[PDB]
Design an enzyme around this catalytic site. Sequence first.
Site, short mmCIF file in Angstrom:
data_model
loop_
_atom_site.label_atom_id
_atom_site.label_comp_id
_atom_site.label_asym_id
_atom_site.label_seq_id
_atom_site.Cartn_x
_atom_site.Cartn_y
_atom_site.Cartn_z
N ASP A 36 1.03 18.46 7.45
CA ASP A 36 2.39 17.94 7.55
C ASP A 36 3.19 18.51 8.72
O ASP A 36 3.77 19.59 8.60
CB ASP A 36 3.12 18.20 6.21
N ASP A 232 5.69 13.01 12.83
CA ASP A 232 5.50 13.46 11.45
C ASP A 232 4.26 12.91 10.75
O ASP A 232 4.29 11.83 10.17
CB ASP A 232 6.77 13.13 10.63
C1 LIG Z 1 9.03 13.25 5.09
N1 LIG Z 1 8.35 14.40 4.50
C2 LIG Z 1 7.51 15.26 5.16
N2 LIG Z 1 7.11 15.13 6.38
N3 LIG Z 1 7.13 16.24 4.28
C3 LIG Z 1 7.69 16.02 2.95
C4 LIG Z 1 8.43 17.27 2.50
C5 LIG Z 1 7.82 18.51 2.60
C6 LIG Z 1 8.45 19.67 2.19
C7 LIG Z 1 9.72 19.61 1.66
C8 LIG Z 1 10.36 18.38 1.54
C9 LIG Z 1 9.71 17.23 1.95
C10 LIG Z 1 6.59 15.52 2.04
C11 LIG Z 1 6.57 15.82 0.69
C12 LIG Z 1 5.56 15.33 -0.11
C13 LIG Z 1 4.56 14.53 0.41
C14 LIG Z 1 4.57 14.21 1.75
N4 LIG Z 1 3.62 13.40 2.39
C15 LIG Z 1 2.81 12.42 1.83
O1 LIG Z 1 2.66 12.24 0.64
C16 LIG Z 1 2.13 11.61 2.81
C17 LIG Z 1 1.40 10.44 2.71
C18 LIG Z 1 0.97 10.11 4.03
C19 LIG Z 1 1.45 11.10 4.85
O2 LIG Z 1 2.14 12.00 4.11
C20 LIG Z 1 5.58 14.71 2.54
C21 LIG Z 1 8.58 14.82 3.21
O3 LIG Z 1 9.34 14.33 2.38
#
Ligand SMILES: CN1C(=N)N[C@](c2ccccc2)(c2cccc(NC(=O)c3ccco3)c2)C1=O
Length: 390
Positions: A36, A232
């Site tokens: 991520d 991202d």
């Molecule tokens: C937009 N985004 C991100 N960049 N990371 C978060 C996140 C991470 C930490 C704290 C708050 C938010 C996340 C949280 C949970 C899952 C996913 N990602 C996925 O499930 C996914 C599916 C495909 C690519 O990523 C991403 C999120 O909101």
Amino acid sequence: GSFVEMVDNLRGKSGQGYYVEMTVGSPPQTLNILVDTGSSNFAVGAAPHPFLHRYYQRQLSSTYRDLRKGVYVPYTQGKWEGELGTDLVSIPHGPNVTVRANIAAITESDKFFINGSNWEGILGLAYAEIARPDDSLEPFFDSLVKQTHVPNLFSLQLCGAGFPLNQSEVLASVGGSMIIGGIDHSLYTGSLWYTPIRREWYYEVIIVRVEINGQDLKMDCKEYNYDKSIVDSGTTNLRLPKKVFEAAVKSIKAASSTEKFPDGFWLGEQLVCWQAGTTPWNIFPVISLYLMGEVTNQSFRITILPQQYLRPVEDVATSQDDCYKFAISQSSTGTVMGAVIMEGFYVVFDRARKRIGFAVSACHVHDEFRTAAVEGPFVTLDMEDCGYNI
Ligand SMILES: CN1C(=N)N[C@](c2ccccc2)(c2cccc(NC(=O)c3ccco3)c2)C1=O
């Protein structure tokens, strides 16, 4: 040059996420971890959850250190909460090093873990500024660089299959590569072009021009980066600011007007299907995003195909049709170059030189007539004016 030990170390897909194997604790506990670039915490499932078949067991790790501090992270699509601590962490198909890193042990979560995704935690690769609860919690990559001789750079090749992968196939398929500490020349074709990292919090960049099949969207370039533009891997779609989304969808609809699609398709909610092998790729336009170059008044462009922005999905009827969802959606938090865009390119997160590199991916999906592209230079003026300021 060549980093064979890390090539093909990712699995997954754009809709559920791309993950890498990691180990935490002593003796090592193996977990699959979402890559991520849009967050900065190393956060792992540490308590039973219906969608987890494994989790971090702190009581079984002799090197576990409790930081006696909680972390509560409610976000747009869900929430996670846990307990901060540190432990020894390794990447089995990564550099041959073990580091002491911060770990947020997730004890409660809502809509965080995805049923069938095969990952048990997330590896936030962005900077300390956006770490939770605050910037004093050193992100994993910062710890890795400080404790080892690993160069301050990583690169990602996310590989979309171009078709749906069932439960078994997605577990057996190579989803791409995360090269820690370098650039592997086998993962791309042509040249790498670099755009500056505007600021070190998210991997923030500046888009200076947008074209749909070479037709300029003709918006004030500040609109493209309102309120920021980021790279991202933790987001599926290409997300665009409301006004840009509306203009882009109007132009994509006009370019593909020989076929009419329902409103639900353009909303990214409903799938569209064609008889097996007949997807009319040629009626959909290419999308070019021009990015600020490293040289004054210079830009370059990355061009994506509908094979990137139409996400393959299996039909409800499990038919022989080829089905997709429109993977471009609106945002109220700026542009997000998500997994579907990253699938077209080899992306170099050059933290040491505060820049992001793009090259055509050796695994991008295309047809015999068009390919994704990374091209330049172009003369572009007043590019710092494209950046948004609150
Ligand atoms: C937009 N985004 C991100 N960049 N990371 C978060 C996140 C991470 C930490 C704290 C708050 C938010 C996340 C949280 C949970 C899952 C996913 N990602 C996925 O499930 C996914 C599916 C495909 C690519 O990523 C991403 C999120 O909101």
